Amino acid sequence: MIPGSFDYHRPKSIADAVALLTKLGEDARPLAGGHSLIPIMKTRLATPEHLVDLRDIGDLVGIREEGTDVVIGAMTTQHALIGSDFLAAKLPIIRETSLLIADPQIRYMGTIGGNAANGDPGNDMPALMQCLGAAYELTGPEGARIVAARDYYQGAYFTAIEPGELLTAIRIPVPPTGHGYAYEKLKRKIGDYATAAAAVVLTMSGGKCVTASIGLTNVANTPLWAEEAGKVLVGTALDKPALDKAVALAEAITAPASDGRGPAEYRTKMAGVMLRRAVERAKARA
């Protein structure tokens, strides 16, 4: 319950926060909503010497459309994502997913950037951002760069970010008007990380699937983008034979943990059932 001692900073700008993180090095961590970091400080699994709170940086908060993308600041809270009627109109999967994350209190504090950056395979946003083909904007001492969500995760708490960088924004391509979408999660209770979950976006024309993308949550040590499973839906009527193929291809890439949610063979099969159910709801929406 009790964390180790640390020094606490409130930088006023992205530039200042990056300067601090760079100077302080490995012993400093950004502090966003604190609802993954503070819990692991309380267990002393994390014992940073410095916390760099991002609270006073207004440029990190916000939702805007820019070109063919929606750009969401890293400090935008889950509660704000749910509340955004502009996001609901453009990217309605985000509200659906966010309502499946944690509980009201946690959603008031937890941020989209923190959910993306944290590195726990339990987080729901990473696979959704892989499904949507989102890009993460990072700023550090050497300047800006972009890392695809699909390329950001290497393992539990291992990600493509470098020393002294902040994830400043998430850039999400806006799906076509009329697209289908779904996030389908299996969990033990409110607040629980998924036994398995699937994110789907797809478009249809003339009764046939034109595009499909699939993410899978918490059925490996990272989120997964189920590339082949999405591809096999394209050109089909999203009928039983097509879904059986997609389920096979998605199950094949899983490598779940065996924990209180059940053994790895169950979770693999649940990835497939979530996928089936998500594709069906997305089809109907399309």
């Binding site: 009790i2 299996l186 033990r188 209770k189 036994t195 209180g260």
Partner: protein, 795 residues
């Protein structure tokens, strides 16, 4: 009439005023001058010798005042403490650790933040020993010797002591008769039902504030105690302080659920530390330590058999249990009952003969067993019989409702001597079963279920429907002095009621609420007895200096014991008031009759004295034959237990492809005799059914092969939220206890006792048409997926 709020009223709770405003007074709210904070260095190992503890770095940390180890306690003979089960438990580990997270040292610091720092600086050197976690292996010839302090090596069952890991063997019932029945019965129905390890997990953990006043030589001990007087007596016996100089205070308690009966190492260490330092010491455990180091519940492996005729008459029951007690036998029970009241396991049925045997074993796990609305192992007894009824019914190709109805103990048979020794007080089982079946539309549910099974076989649905039945007989109110005692103190309880000159009342009882509403309901009993409004009555519990001695609140005993004492003490006051009335009215006491709130002169009803008038007269114009004032005490030794009962029906739908079960309907009829406060009873039922749902459908504490405790935090331990918890439909009948002064039985544990078999029976029943056999709890989604996987449902 408006003001009375006596028996039967849905009186709103007096506790709520302070609790809704944050003005309860729970242990961690206590702040005393100079108070320090203590907490433990705990074992990383399940089984190991302690080679060395280095505390020097911790002692040297600014703000640290003491670091206790077993070496400091041994001289005081406090390195072990006694348990309610007649074993001992290690306070601080001496030569070895025996369960993961066991206490090894006790750091005392300026506050909890410094204490936590200082715990991390203590270095323990361990020497690993082989871990024992499977109770089925505990009495094998090569099983590890756990309890070196009390046992020598004994590798079999035929030596002059039991196997070293064998705690006890307890048997009851007619072994020869039962074996003869099973040797010739037409049907023998046998299963091994495991009641998995779970935990009461009250929302407030265990905690205390010890304050030794060295100037006065008096100890004050605030704490989370369900039985504060017992704790006083135990602290006296072990510390050598006399009882009149030990002031135990159980203030408001944030739920107990059986977790707060016994003593824990934290209480002993806080007290020792306060005695050493001469200042107060607070100890508050965190959740992970609560779940992994305080009383677990259940952990019974029950080999359960019924003998029957082919036509469905039950002839006998034979049950043997393997009980996993963890490393120390700390199971709270009356002293003569090492398996509690597990010998209520013939349930609601009239059987000629039965036999029960229970073996307790040590393993490298936390201690406990009796906790979490068990009524002293009644949860296990009821699960055994109500599951066995269902598996018998399957084997007979009978509907299990019909099987119960063919076997119920009939109303005219009460008081009914059951074949394992308990004499049930009163019961009307056929009426309650009928009321329940008619309300849920039972025969129509069965036809609906048959059609859904046919649809499943045709490929038309992936859902299956189960109908769970639990018809149970509880036993609560421990208990008669002949055979019920806690460490030699007979299991009475008590009430003291004092009427003030102006007619208000202070009353205290020997129980202790942890949320059951006593402060509201005991006043309702007095209000009806005396005609004094309930709001004119103050109820207190939990300060051992002030409350009459009692045995505490557990085993749903408050209403059977202290509720009886309350009525009897009030009836003493009434009798004295009658004599005062006779003196005032110049008549014979025999000429008077009670009429709500006054005594009237028979056949001159104009002539009367109210209870308020009589209270004043007891002070103002005391009759010369009598003492002034108006008060009474009763210590009530019950003649028997009370035996409430219930009929519970669960309709459950299960998605075979995910394993996800969803309760459709849950109907709970409870009969606890006279109902003091229907609103409170209903809340007790809602809470107990939610626990039953949790235990049956998800909750567990597990250990791996290395002895690591698994799932002992809210990341994994299934506590339902308002989203998961079903809506509850409740109902009742009223069958008073004939021997109780107001006819009231206990009820608070009934919902859990009955509810777990109801849920488990529903799940088992859903899969019965597929021949799944007995499905072991919990019935979470992965486990139910495995059931279906193994039946070939997924291909």
């Amino acid at each position: 009439a408006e003001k009375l709020q006596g028996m039967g009223c849905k009186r709103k709770r007096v506790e709520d005023i302070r609790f809704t405003q944050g003005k309860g007074n729970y242990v961690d709210d206590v702040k005393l001058p100079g108070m320090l904070f203590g907490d433990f260095v705990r074992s990383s190992h399940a089984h190991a010798r302690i080679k060395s503890i280095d505390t020097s770095k911790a002692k040297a940390l600014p703000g640290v005042f003491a670091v206790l180890t077993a070496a400091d306690l041994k001289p005081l003979n406090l390195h072990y403490m006694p348990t309610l089960a007649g074993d001992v438990q290690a306070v601080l580990a001496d030569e070895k650790v025996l369960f993961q997270n066991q206490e090894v040292a006790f750091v005392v610091a300026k506050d909890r933040y410094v204490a936590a720092d200082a715990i991390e600086l203590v270095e323990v050197d361990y020497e690993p020993l082989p871990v024992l976690v499977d109770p089925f292996k505990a009495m094998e010839p090569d099983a590890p010797l756990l309890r070196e302090d009390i046992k020598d090596k004994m590798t079999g069952a035929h030596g002059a002591r039991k196997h070293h890991n064998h705690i006890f063997r307890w048997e009851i019932g007619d072994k020869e008769g039962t074996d003869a029945t099973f040797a010739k019965a037409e049907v023998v129905s046998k299963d091994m039902f495991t009641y998995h390890r779970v935990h009461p997990s009250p929302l407030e953990t265990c905690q205390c504030v010890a304050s030794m006043d060295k100037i006065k030589g008096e100890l004050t001990l605030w704490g989370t105690f369900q039985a504060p007087h017992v704790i006083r007596t135990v602290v006296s016996l072990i510390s050598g302080l006399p009882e009149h100089k030990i002031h135990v205070i159980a203030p408001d308690i944030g739920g107990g659920f059986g977790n707060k009966v016994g003593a824990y190492s934290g209480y002993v260490c806080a007290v020792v530390a306060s005695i050493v330092l001469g200042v107060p010491v607070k100890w508050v455990e965190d959740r992970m330590e609560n779940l992994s180091t305080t009383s677990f519940a259940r952990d019974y492996h029950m080999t359960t058999e019924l003998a029957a005729t082919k036509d469905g008459k039950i002839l006998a029951m034979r049950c043997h249990v393997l009980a996993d007690h963890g490393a120390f036998d700390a199971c709270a029970d009356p002293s003569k009952w090492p398996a509690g009241f597990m010998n209520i396991c013939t349930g609601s049925y009239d059987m000629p003969v039965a036999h029960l045997a229970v073996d307790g074993v040590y393993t490298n796990k936390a201690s406990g067993g009796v906790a979490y609305r068990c009524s002293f192992r009644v949860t296990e007894a009821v699960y055994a019989i109500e599951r066995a009824i269902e598996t018998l019914a399957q084997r007979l190709e009978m509907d299990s409702a019909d099987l119960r109805i063919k076997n119920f103990i009939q109303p005219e048979q009460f008081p009914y001597m059951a074949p394992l020794g308990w004499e049930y007080d009163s019961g009307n089982y056929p009426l309650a079963m009928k009321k329940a079946m008619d309300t849920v539309g039972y025969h129509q549910l069965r036809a609906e279920q048959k059609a859904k099974q046919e649809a499943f076989k045709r490929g038309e649905t992936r859902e299956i429907m189960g109908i769970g039945i639990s018809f149970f007989t509880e036993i609560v109110g421990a208990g008669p002095s002949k055979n019920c005692d806690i460490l030699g103190v007979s299991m009475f309880d008590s009430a003291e009621i004092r009427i003030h000159p102006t007619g208000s009342v202070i009353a205290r009882m020997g129980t202790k609420s942890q949320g059951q509403g006593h402060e509201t309901t005991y006043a309702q009993i007095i209000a009806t007895e005396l005609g004094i409004p309930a709001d004119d009555i103050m109820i207190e519990e939990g300060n051992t200096d002030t409350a009459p001695y009692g045995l505490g609140t557990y085993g749903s005993r408050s209403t059977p014991t202290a509720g009886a004492a309350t009525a009897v003490a009030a009836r003493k006051i009434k009798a004295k008031a009658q004599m005062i009335a006779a003196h005032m009215l110049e008549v014979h006491e025999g000429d008077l009759e009670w009429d709500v709130d006054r005594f009237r002169v028979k056949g001159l009803p104009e002539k009367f004295k109210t209870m308020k008038e009589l209270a004043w007269a007891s002070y103002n114009s005391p009759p010369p034959n009598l003492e002034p004032g108006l008060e009474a005490v009763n210590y009530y030794d019950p003649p028997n237990m009370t035996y409430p009962f219930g009929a519970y029906f669960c309709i459950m739908d299960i998605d075979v492809d995910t394993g996800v079960a969803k309760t459709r309907r849950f109907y709970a009829l409870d009969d606890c005799g006279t109902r003091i406060n229907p609103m409170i009873i209903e809340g007790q039922v809602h809470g107990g059914l939610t626990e039953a749902f949790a235990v049956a459908m998800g909750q567990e504490i597990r250990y791996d092969e290395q002895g690591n405790v698994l799932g002992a935090s809210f990341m994994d331990f299934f506590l339902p939220t308002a989203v998961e918890t079903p809506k509850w439909e409740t109902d009742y009948t009223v069958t008073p206890s004939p021997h109780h002064p107001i006819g009231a039985k206990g009820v608070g544990e009934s919902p859990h006792v009955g509810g777990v078999p109801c849920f488990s029976n529903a799940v088992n029943d859903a899969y019965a048409f597929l021949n799944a056999g007995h499905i072991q709890m919990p019935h979470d989604a992965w486990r139910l997926w495995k059931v279906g996987e193994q039946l070939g449902l997924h291909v």
